[PDB]
Amino acid sequence: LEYSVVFNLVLWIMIGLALAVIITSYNIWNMDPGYDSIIYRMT
Amino acid sequence: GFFSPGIWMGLLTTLFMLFIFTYGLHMILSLKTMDRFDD
Amino acid sequence: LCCGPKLAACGIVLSAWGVIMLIMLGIFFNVHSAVLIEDVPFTEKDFENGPQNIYNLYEQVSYNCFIAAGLYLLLGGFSFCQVRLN
Amino acid sequence: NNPEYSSFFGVMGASSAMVFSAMGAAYGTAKSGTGIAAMSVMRPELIMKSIIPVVMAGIIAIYGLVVAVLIANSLTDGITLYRSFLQLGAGLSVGLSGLAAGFAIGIVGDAGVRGTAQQPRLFVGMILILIFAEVLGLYGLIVALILSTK
Amino acid sequence: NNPEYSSFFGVMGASSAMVFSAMGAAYGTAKSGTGIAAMSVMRPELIMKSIIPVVMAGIIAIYGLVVAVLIANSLTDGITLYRSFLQLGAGLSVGLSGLAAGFAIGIVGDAGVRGTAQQPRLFVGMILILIFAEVLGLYGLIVALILSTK
Amino acid sequence: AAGFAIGIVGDAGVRGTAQQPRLFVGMILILIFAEVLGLYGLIVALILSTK
Amino acid sequence: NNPEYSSFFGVMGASSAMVFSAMGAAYGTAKSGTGIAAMSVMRPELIMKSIIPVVMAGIIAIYGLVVAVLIANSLTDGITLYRSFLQLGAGLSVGLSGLAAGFAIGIVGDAGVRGTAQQPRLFVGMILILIFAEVLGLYGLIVALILSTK
Amino acid sequence: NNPEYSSFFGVMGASSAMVFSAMGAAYGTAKSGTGIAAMSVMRPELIMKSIIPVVMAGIIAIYGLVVAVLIANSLTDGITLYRSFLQLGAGLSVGLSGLAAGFAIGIVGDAGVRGTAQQPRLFVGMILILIFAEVLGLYGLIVALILSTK
Amino acid sequence: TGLELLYLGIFVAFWACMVVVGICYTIFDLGFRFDVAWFLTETSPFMWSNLGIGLAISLSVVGAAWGIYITGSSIIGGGVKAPRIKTKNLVSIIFCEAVAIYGIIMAIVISNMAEPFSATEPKAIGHRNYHAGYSMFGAGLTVGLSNLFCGVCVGIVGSGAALADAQNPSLFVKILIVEIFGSAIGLFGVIVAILQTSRVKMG
Amino acid sequence: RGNVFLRQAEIENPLEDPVTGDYVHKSVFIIFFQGDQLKNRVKKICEGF
Amino acid sequence: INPAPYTVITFPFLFAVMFGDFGHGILMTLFAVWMVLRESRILSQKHENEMFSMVFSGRYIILLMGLFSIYTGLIYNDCFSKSLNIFGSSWSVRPMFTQGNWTEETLLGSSVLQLNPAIPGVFGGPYPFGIDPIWNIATNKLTFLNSFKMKMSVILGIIHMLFGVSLSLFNHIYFKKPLNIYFGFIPEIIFMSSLFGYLVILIFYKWTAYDAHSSRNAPSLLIHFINMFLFSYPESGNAMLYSGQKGIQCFLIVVAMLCVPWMLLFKPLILRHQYLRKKFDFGDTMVHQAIHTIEYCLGCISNTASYLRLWALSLAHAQLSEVLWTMVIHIGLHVRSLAGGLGLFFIFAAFATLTVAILLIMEGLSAFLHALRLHWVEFQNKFYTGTGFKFLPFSFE
Amino acid sequence: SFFPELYFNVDNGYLEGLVRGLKAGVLSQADYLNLVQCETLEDLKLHLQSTDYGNFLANEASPLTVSVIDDKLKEKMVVEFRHMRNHAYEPLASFLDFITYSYMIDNVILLITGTLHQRSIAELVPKCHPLGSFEQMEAVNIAQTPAELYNAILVDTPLAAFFQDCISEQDLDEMNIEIIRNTLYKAYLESFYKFCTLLGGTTADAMCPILEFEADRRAFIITINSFGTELSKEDRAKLFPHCGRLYPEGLAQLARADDYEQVKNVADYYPEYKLLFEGAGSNPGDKTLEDRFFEHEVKLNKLAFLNQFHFGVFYAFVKLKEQECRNIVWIAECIAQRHRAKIDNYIPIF
């Protein structure tokens, strides 16, 4: 008994952590160097 | 059972509040600032 | 000269309002003993004995309408003096 | 007797009354500030003239605070589900009315400052529309009181 | 007499009131610093005229700190469910209010910093807007200290 | 996290050092801190593998 | 006797039946008004001749209302599950058909207003297209009716 | 001897047989409009010659109508799960086949109507394409019939 | 696509999981635990009733706010070079707030019939109570959504009218008709809600 | 490409404008070269400022 | 008809209808007198603040609405969140309550609230002085206050709207346009009266007739109104308001419905009749007329519905005043013997400033603009055509 | 509930109203009929005061000349456009940037072709359009090879993105500059079309025809201009836009053209181009092809103004008003030549 409590607890904590790490990692991967001086110039 | 009545009640209420919160969060998070000043 | 009236007249009006309303509050807390309709708060927890305590403590609470107003009595007099300084 | 889950819902209502409404006010203020920038350089004399939108945002916050205090005093250990759901409904409705009004005031305030930056006669007009924003918040608050009795 | 999971909600509040509050500060000091970067060039001597939003962000962080500490200080093993719900609600409300206030302070600071850079007399007026955002912070704190005892 | 930091910093610094050799030695210092971060990520796990 | 949860399906059927039709009518009228307002500047002397798509868009709202009135009238606190499922089916069918008709009418009137502004002779042709949208919605009505009287 | 919720699926079939099909028809007409007006600006005489895709969309809608009427007539309170599942399948199949046919007819009609304004000899070829997109819907009807008689 | 990818991902994952669990339950002969009756009965009707009460003004106020801002931006933008239209276009915002008025009166109507009971098992709560709760929740949802979309529609048409009116000042009298035809649906939702909640007798 | 070098300085008082009268900011710069080709080519850049 | 003599007095009255508080009335009146008494000085002065200029332009309105706010607050009996108690309460005396089988129930009452059912048979008594004061601490004051505000707002709105609409007949006879009065204003007024004067009579009837002893079985007015709107006639569940309800109610609704076709159809037929007698796009004439008629019907429903802002603002004022009293300076009541008034000094300073900055200035402005909006839209969209030009004199400048 | 119309105004409502108000400033036929009767330039200024253009000649223009009129008109242009730009957020900002790129390219090629002749070095500034001003407008005077021109343009001027990999040359003569012009304009049109189709919604629907027509117009112009010159045919094939409706026959029929007859035989295949070319019959008394092209251009922009939430009401607007300036100039020219023979050659708008 109390299966529902522990199950919902585990599920929602895990979902929260997974969504947090996914969204933050998505933000980090997409970031702008600059394509401003160092990167813009060629030749 | 995978659920109990009180759990379902709380889940539905939290879902409603969460939907409303994320709507508000989207609207505030789309805000942008100007680039240059007049004159 | 010092503390010109431009930034102090609001002080005088506020002081006048404070003194008048504090005298009113003290008078309606003492003479009328602040009938419970006009006052919820009191100062005790055990009032199972009789009415002497309630009116006594109501007088003590109204007495506190003293320095309260007196504080302004003065502050108004000081601010008027600063206003006079031209 | 009553379940132990019952105390949950009502408390949550209070939180809404101090989240959602507040958030709306926040947006409003931010947007108005941007407007002031675009207007500060060219028409410098009317900076204080544009104190009117920002306060008209903060009032939304005030409304939230009112209802919150009320739902912090009607909370007791022995609450039936009826009372809990009444209070949750009040909190949700007031928070969302505050949020919607906040969005409206923010947009209208940007437009108002920008319009007055080029046309003094527009001033009064903007004020009119701004009223129609703020009043919306009050409508939410109304049902809160109706839900502290029935 | 009372389930052990009663602890849940309570200490989650003791986390959240901190967490979200910090996020707000991370927007108040950051974007304002980005604005001061532009300000520094044209008139490097107005750093004292632009240190306001960062102190505001620190203030809201202190607000989160004090609510989180006070709520954490009331922890016990046999906590009732009622108290647990109370603490969770207070913590969440203050946390999200702090987040919103941080957002507003950051945006207005970034606008007003460069606005003052181009136009000196904006400066004093800029402070006005910041104060109103700070008021929202106060309001969050109030609710928690109304939910700690009652 | 360490991989992300190393990748971004390495790209920016390598493209930068293409023109000014003096920056090169300085680059390594930044990278060192990145390594240190990864080291922490190992250390905690080690204790949790014995406790 | 019937089980306790009989009326939920009928209630939600009526709710959806009105709601989706209102969605469709709102979209249609919004689009038609956009077209009219765009067109009025060039050739105002034809305005009365071009409001027809709005009049046709109103018929979707009429269909939604009539099905809603019948379906609510038939309802009772103790219906059988067969009836309530007929109710739900009829409501869904009329609502979705109304939405599709609204989409069609809106887009067609949008194109047609400018088309008529370009060349008067288009007009009668436009009318024919409008009919082949309107009847589509009409068909939905009759199907729902057979479901409601079954 | 049979559950009553078995009726559920059957009524749902009716809805699909008129819902998804209906949507397809709507889309087709809309696309035709964005061609037809766009063609009438230069060659008005061709308008009556470019209504064909709309009548074909009408036939597409009529298919769903007839199948829905038959399905609704078959319904009764005491249906076994067999007939209900058959009704559901027939309705779903005809509805979604009609949707696909309408989508194709719409794109085809727009492209062909725009094209024929420059090369008249396109005309006959265009109609060939149309029939090859109409028979699609016809095939839906066929399978539905085989499920209704059985 | 900047951040809506997250929303699409959540939606698709949720529905895929729903299909998977549904088929898993069906083919396992385990359908007796998918008791819709248990969910619909053991959940007290008060939660549905108060959700309806809140929504009935939630959505109305949202629609009103949307309409006011969408019309306001355009009117004030156009008034910068045409001050004569400043006051003339109040009618659009009047119609926009009319939906909020309708929403709040509906909330007052629905709020009645809220008599608490003491039953605890479904047999004791009874058919009348369940019907009342479901019906008034449905009416609240209906009025909310109808008023929302009416507000959006009238806001859009008012924006168009205000933009057009700045040009030729003899056009406003031939564009309010669409506005009224918009307000019609906002009223239709109200009357359907009344028709739904007519016979509630909770107790 | 770095063959020349530059160093700058600035005056805290703002400087009057001959044309508009404004107290617009101004600054001084000193550039060092190695050869006459640089002395030639650099004036095209310097006259743009 | 210039609407100045009406507005000049109906604007302070409406502001007072939404500014039910007496101390704030005194404050606004003091503000107004301060501005007014320095007329000569200020007009002979150089000022720069534009707020000061607009306020000095509106000193007359500000003074009048302050003076009316004083009275309306006095009848409200809500001066600074409290009730000015003239001590004429006649509610509960001990031996009367013990006569009604109630003695020493406060023991269990130390944790509960114990509403008293009314009418033990020895109590009652209205109050000449406005609203009886005891409500100010009653925990159920909200219900009766809200009912009273509901009925207040609706009734005032209906009467004010009747005043607004009744004026057009004067101008119609003045301009000598018989077709626009016989088949014009008459259907409009009969429709409005038959719809809403019925509500007025019914609400007064419920107020005056149903005694306390018949609390159960008492009807709900809105249910009756909706029932007649939908024509449903249940035989049980709600009792008829008074004898002969069916015939009168049915007749009023049918005549109201039969009123519309006159304005909808009749007049353009007559215009075409006289035009043909002479021998003018008749279709255009009925189009414009029908648009006007449906606009009138829907608009009048909307205006009658839009009158609740009065209740809204009054409630917001009440609640805000209560909280402003009871949150900050309520703490002034304490136990200290010597250093108490010291704290009360700063506490009241903060309280006064906060009410100045929350209610006196900005929310009052919102209320004033709402009064203005009501004076414009739901008033002047009945008779005020508003199509003309003022003078642009050649006075030199 | 359309896709693009719900969220347009939230940050683009004010500017839209401002531009729509400014669109009323185009003069209808009545004002042109009025203004064609002026007797002197002072008369023209007096009439210009009474229109929406009023009060921009309160200077000391006692010897009033057409130069001051043109300069003031362009000054009004640039001040108005700059004010419009300085109140916009990021998407609209990229849009208006994309607009000004055209004038930037024009100014760069004007300056390089000016300094190609050594007779002028620094007096070329007043001729360039003030709108197309970037920080390095003077670096053009240091470029001896187009590689050096790239090195000057690379850093801050974003025009690099339009020719960074399309030009590979080391010698800077007077012939290749036309190639530079054509390639830069080609890349600009391509990028603008891609940006428009990305932006999605009604903006794409309401702006695709304009860009398509501009592409075909430039294609035909470059074809006709290169008949009797040293430009090789393959290079010409390497210069057409690829966003018009002449995609197949643009690369399969135009490149195989050598006189006006074949261009006629290709243009007559489409309806609209057939009509446009027939109208411009190149007769002595008939207008040249350029005038008919301008007429179609103004027709398209005028038609484009019938959609509420379409971004291009900005872009379109600018183009239209620029044409208006040209019209006024022509009228004043007649008042300088003291004859009204060709005063009716204006092209009416609205």
Residue numbers in the entry:
A (entry chain p): 599 to 641
B (entry chain c): 413 to 451
C (entry chain f): 5 to 90
D (entry chain g), E (entry chain h), G (entry chain o), H (entry chain n): 6 to 155
F (entry chain j): 105 to 155
I (entry chain b): 3 to 204, 206
J (entry chain a): 192 to 240
K (entry chain a): 389 to 667, 712 to 829
What does the publication say?
The V1 domain comprises three pairs of subunits responsible for ATP binding and hydrolysis, and its activity is coupled to the rotation of a central stalk in the V0 domain, mediating the translocation of protons across the membrane. The V1 domain reversibly disassembles from the V0 domain in a luminal pH-dependent manner.
In our cryo-ET reconstructions of ISVs, we found both ‘intact’ (that is, V0 and V1) and V0 domain-only V-ATPase assemblies in the ISVs, demonstrating that a mixture of intact and V0-only V-ATPases exists in functional ISVs, consistent with observations of V1 domain dissociation. Starting with published V-ATPase structures and the AlphaFold2-predicted synaptophysin model, we refined atomic models of both the intact and the V0-only V-ATPase assemblies in complex with synaptophysin using the wild-type ISV SPA average maps. We observed the glycosylated mammalian-specific ATP6AP1-binding partner in our maps. The luminal parts of subunit e2 and subunit a form an interface with synaptophysin, and electrostatic interactions are involved in this interface. The interaction is identical for both intact and V0-only V-ATPase assemblies, suggesting that this interaction does not appear to directly regulate the hydrolysis mechanism of the V-ATPase. The confined membrane environment of a synaptic vesicle, including vesicle curvature, probably contributes to stabilizing the relatively small V-ATPase–synaptophysin interface.
